[PDB]
Design an enzyme around this catalytic site. Structure first.
Site, mmCIF file in Angstrom:
data_model
loop_
_atom_site.group_PDB
_atom_site.id
_atom_site.type_symbol
_atom_site.label_atom_id
_atom_site.label_comp_id
_atom_site.label_asym_id
_atom_site.label_seq_id
_atom_site.Cartn_x
_atom_site.Cartn_y
_atom_site.Cartn_z
ATOM 1 N N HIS A 47 20.269 30.781 64.132
ATOM 2 C CA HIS A 47 19.978 31.146 65.501
ATOM 3 C C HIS A 47 18.494 30.939 65.761
ATOM 4 O O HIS A 47 17.708 30.804 64.831
ATOM 5 C CB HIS A 47 20.368 32.606 65.752
ATOM 6 N N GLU A 58 16.173 30.034 62.732
ATOM 7 C CA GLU A 58 16.279 30.816 61.523
ATOM 8 C C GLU A 58 17.641 30.563 60.898
ATOM 9 O O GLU A 58 18.676 30.808 61.518
ATOM 10 C CB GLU A 58 16.124 32.293 61.879
ATOM 11 N N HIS A 60 20.161 31.274 57.572
ATOM 12 C CA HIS A 60 20.411 32.166 56.455
ATOM 13 C C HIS A 60 20.959 31.391 55.255
ATOM 14 O O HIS A 60 22.154 31.121 55.188
ATOM 15 C CB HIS A 60 21.372 33.272 56.890
ATOM 16 N N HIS A 86 13.205 38.546 54.978
ATOM 17 C CA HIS A 86 12.676 39.123 56.206
ATOM 18 C C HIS A 86 11.358 39.826 55.901
ATOM 19 O O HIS A 86 10.352 39.611 56.580
ATOM 20 C CB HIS A 86 13.666 40.115 56.810
HETATM 21 ZN ZN LIG Z 1 18.897 35.832 61.149
HETATM 22 ZN ZN LIG Z 2 16.924 37.948 61.180
#
Ligand SMILES: [Zn+2]
Ligand SMILES: [Zn+2]
Length: 90
Positions: A47, A58, A60, A86
């Site tokens: 996203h 970003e 994952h 993070h």
């Molecule tokens: Zn994220």
């Molecule tokens: Zn995040």
């Protein structure tokens, strides 16, 4: 395929990550798709970065190992910005 370029911070992030046992093949697979602009496997949540007023996204790689990247379509470039948790990036 988009040109793939890294930042100096990204390079340090990875060097470090490799030292702690990170699988580079995980990275190659994700960065590859991103650069040929194909959709990621469901695993890899993707996203925009809210709070990045520049089109940072970003991905994952693991639920708390993030690939922060920027596509610069004007230069045909995928820019790899940071790679970490993070806690480490923010
Ligand atoms: Zn994220
Ligand atoms: Zn995040």
């Amino acid at each position: 395929m988009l040109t793939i370029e890294t930042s100096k911070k990204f390079d340090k992030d990875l060097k470090i990550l490799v030292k702690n046992g990170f699988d580079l093949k995980l990275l190659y697979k994700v960065v590859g798709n991103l650069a040929t602009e194909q959709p990621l496997a469901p695993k890899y949540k993707d996203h925009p970065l809210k709070g990045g007023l520049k089109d940072f996204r970003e991905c994952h790689l693991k639920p708390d190992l993030l690939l922060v990247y920027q596509i610069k379509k004007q230069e045909n470039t995928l820019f790899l910005v940071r790679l970490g948790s993070h806690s480490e990036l923010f």
